[PDB]
Amino acid sequence: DTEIIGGLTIPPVVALVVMSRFGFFAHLLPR
Structure with a gap:
């Protein structure tokens, strides 16, 4: 029972x- x-x-x-x-993936990005 967990909708929200x-x-x-x-x-x-x-x-x-x-x-x-x-934040790690946001700064590292797909590079």
């Missing part, structure tokens, strides 16, 4: 690793 809410019960260390990964 999936899993927002995570620690700050996990969310921090996800944010840095997003």
Whole structure:
């Protein structure tokens, strides 16, 4: 039963690793 809410019960260390990964590909780009 998860239409809009999936899993927002995570620690700050996990969310921090996800944010840095997003910026990594944005700066590295397909090169």
